[PDB]
């Protein structure tokens, strides 16, 4: 149907990709198919190669303290393209079957089986001053013309196409995010029951979250305010699991619960980008360009993080806080902070056609 053709600065090297959005089925990934149109009698008899980088422009340190763009290629694959490989007995896919016949004998395919336990493209939100090369995992299909793998990869003919290993929400939700916490405040009375729960395990981007804050404060202390906050657990695995929790939506209503009384009010709230545009370092869905993308979908993989060596594992949970009055003597300076954490996956629904249609000025 439609293909994506990028050309080198000279024009001799051209790469025809099928789709720049590859779904991760956790167990398996969509192979990166495509063809490369290379001039036989005009490339000065130089073999051309295809390189799938998985650049991770992140890691430890912050604000350029001791680290600046520490690119770590989590997975790089190089396949010979101009030579028709050594006994290439592999399927050509329907994408390269029609493309090869259309362009002729000067177009040679290349396939990139992406590893299963490898991160999804999640570009960290750049700061207002920050621009250009952002952070986070970013895949790239890079076809260059080099006699050997180490030939400086001449920039004139080093075509690179940016792709994503996007992931979409499962079509089968299971349990309910029900989890309760109890605390014997000052060991006075029976512990308060904060039996908060959500409405649905999987929340699509923009859909509401129904936080059903249920409180039975039996202790003498009464809550000054109840805050329900949705947090984005960006667990950057480049370091020793340097998890960076970040709240993306807050609902702190001054509704107060009396001692020896019950309370139950659904704290409907929704995470979006307008209120979180200021928060730099936020994990966003992978960007092929400076386009605006949603918050990073909850990253999932086969058996969870079965072999997650490194990469941003974005996960979401809501924080059902309960700001109570100070235990015993209250000096208006301290407050007990009973809270409950409820997990949920904020992943896009499964699309049918090409993912993005957003208007591009």
């Amino acid at each position, epitope marked *: 149907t439609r293909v994506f053709k990028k050309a080198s600065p000279n024009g001799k090297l051209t790469v025809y990709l099928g789709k720049r959005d590859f779904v991760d089925h956790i167990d398996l990934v969509d192979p990166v198919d495509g063809v490369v149109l290379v001039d036989p009698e005009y490339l000065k008899e130089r073999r051309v190669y295809v390189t799938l980088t998985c650049a991770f422009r992140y890691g430890r340190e912050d604000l350029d303290v001791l680290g600046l763009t520490f690119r770590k290629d989590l997975f790089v694959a190089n396949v010979q393209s101009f030579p028709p490989a050594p006994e290439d007995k592999k399927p050509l896919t329907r994408l390269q079957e029609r493309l090869i016949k259309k362009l002729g004998e000067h177009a040679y395919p290349f396939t990139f089986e992406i590893p299963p336990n490898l991160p999804c493209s999640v570009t960290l939100q750049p700061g207002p001053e920050d621009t250009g090369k952002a952070c986070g995992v970013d895949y790239e299909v890079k076809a260059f013309c080099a006699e050997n793998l180490e030939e400086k990869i001449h920039k004139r003919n080093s075509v690179r196409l940016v792709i994503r290993k996007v992931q979409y929400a499962p079509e089968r939700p299971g349990p309910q995010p029900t989890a309760e916490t109890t605390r014997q405040f000052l060991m006075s009375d029976k512990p308060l029951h904060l039996e908060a729960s959500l409405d649905k395990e999987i929340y699509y981007h*923009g859909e509401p979250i129904s936080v059903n804050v249920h409180v039975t404060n039996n202790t003498n202390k009464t809550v000054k305010k109840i805050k329900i906050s949705v947090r984005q657990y960006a667990d950057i695995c480049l370091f020793n699991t340097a998890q960076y929790k970040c709240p993306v939506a807050m609902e702190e209503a001054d509704d107060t619960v009396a001692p020896s009384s019950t309370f139950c009010k659904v704290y409907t709230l*929704t995470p979006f980008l307008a209120n979180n545009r200021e928060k730099r370092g936020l994990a966003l869905d992978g960007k092929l360009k400076h386009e605006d993308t*949603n918050l990073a979908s909850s990253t999932l993989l086969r058996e969870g993080a079965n072999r997650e060596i490194l990469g941003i594992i974005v996960s979401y949970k809501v924080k059902v806080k309960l700001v109570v009055s100070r235990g015993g003597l209250l000096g208006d300076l301290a407050s007990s902070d009973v809270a409950v954490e409820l997990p949920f996956t904020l992943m896009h629904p499964k*699309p049918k*056609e090409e993912p993005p*249609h957003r*208007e591009v000025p």
Partner: antibody, heavy 118, light 107 residues
Framework: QLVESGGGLVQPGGSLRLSCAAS????????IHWVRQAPGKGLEWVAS????????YYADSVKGRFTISADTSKNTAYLQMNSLRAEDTAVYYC?????????????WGQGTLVTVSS | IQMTQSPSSLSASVGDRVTITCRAS??????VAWYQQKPGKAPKLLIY???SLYSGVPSRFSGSRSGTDFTLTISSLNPEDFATYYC?????????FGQGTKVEIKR
């Protein structure tokens, strides 16, 4: 299901306020678009309040005349037709394109005609 | 962008093929949608992505795809299909609609 109101007569240079009562939809998961149709003429885009990326696009004709907002608590995308010229008389429609995967303007409002004359 | 529908008026009765070609001023890729508007009613989405047919509409409508031209074939042309059709692009912020193609019974 979308419902709109606010049509009537405005003097040349006056101001009118139109709103959409988006029912069953969300203002964050679905951008709200206001579409103009002159009587006997083709459709013409006016404004679009994404309300997720916080961007409110505008037509070249009505650039700063409009101030479209979005009251998410009431699930409305309020629009302000201000400085209505005589040639701004039309029927104004409300459309709800998906915030992600645009896929056209599927849900449409009834339409509130805004006649501007002295 | 200036998307224009060459068949401004289609005087075709039921059972006659009705191809409404809409050619954009410049390449709008595959971001074109088609709406059907009855006389004095609200437009109804028919197809999106210039090929994908919207859920809940008859399969008589089928959109073509080209460099800048986006035809819409109907063929059956039921009485419900006798309305005005608009081609709209969403590949750029100034979303541009088509002029409109009124379809009337041939007499």
């Amino acid at each position: 299901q979308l419902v709109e109101s606010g049509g009537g007569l405005v003097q040349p240079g006056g101001s009118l306020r139109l709103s959409c009562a988006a029912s069953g939809f969300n203002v964050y998961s679905s951008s709200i678009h206001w579409v103009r149709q002159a009587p006997g003429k083709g459709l013409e885009w006016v404004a679009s309040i994404s309300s997720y990326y916080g961007y409110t696009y505008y037509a070249d004709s009505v650039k700063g005349r409009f101030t479209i907002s979005a009251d998410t608590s009431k699930n409305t995308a309020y629009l302000q037709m201000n400085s209505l010229r005589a040639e701004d008389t039309a029927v104004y429609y409300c459309a709800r394109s998906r915030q992600f995967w645009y896929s056209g303007l599927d849900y449409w409002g009834q339409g509130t005609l805004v006649t501007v004359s002295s | 962008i200036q998307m224009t529908q060459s068949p401004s008026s289609l005087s075709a009765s039921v059972g006659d093929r009705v191809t409404i070609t809409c050619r954009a001023s410049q390449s709008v890729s595959s971001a074109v949608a088609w709406y059907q508007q009855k006389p004095g009613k609200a437009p109804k989405l028919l197809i999106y992505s210039a090929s994908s047919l919207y859920s809940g509409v008859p399969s008589r409508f089928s959109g073509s795809r080209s460099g800048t031209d986006f035809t819409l074939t109907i063929s059956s042309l039921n009485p419900e299909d006798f309305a005005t059709y608009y081609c709209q692009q969403y590949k750029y912020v100034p979303v541009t609609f088509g002029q409109g193609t009124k379809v009337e019974i041939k007499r």
